[PDB]
Amino acid sequence: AMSGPAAYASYVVRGANLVTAVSYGRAMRNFEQFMARIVDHPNALPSVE
Amino acid sequence: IAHGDGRRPNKQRQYIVMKACNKHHIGAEIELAAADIELLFAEKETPLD
Helix, strand or coil, X not given: CCCXXXXXXXXXXXXXXXXXXXXXXXXXXXXXXXXXXXXXXXXXXXXXX | CCCXXXXXXXXXXXXXXXXXXXXXCCCCCCCXXXXXXXXXXXXXXXXXX
């Protein structure tokens, strides 16, 4: 007997993903976490922890 | 108006004038795409829809 997730993971293009998906021909995955790396807190070296 | 010269007298007159309407027609043509008429009825799926 093992443990595991009961459902799939959702990915919805709601929010600021939708503006770049309509205006340009592209769309991120997790725009919000991708934005907090660049502009909210720059020059931070990647660390797995 | 009568007067005292040698001119003939004037009997009373009557004028009868007939006027009628004129018909006019107007037409404009609109095209609507078949996909545009269709997806007004298709169901909501996602925020990009």
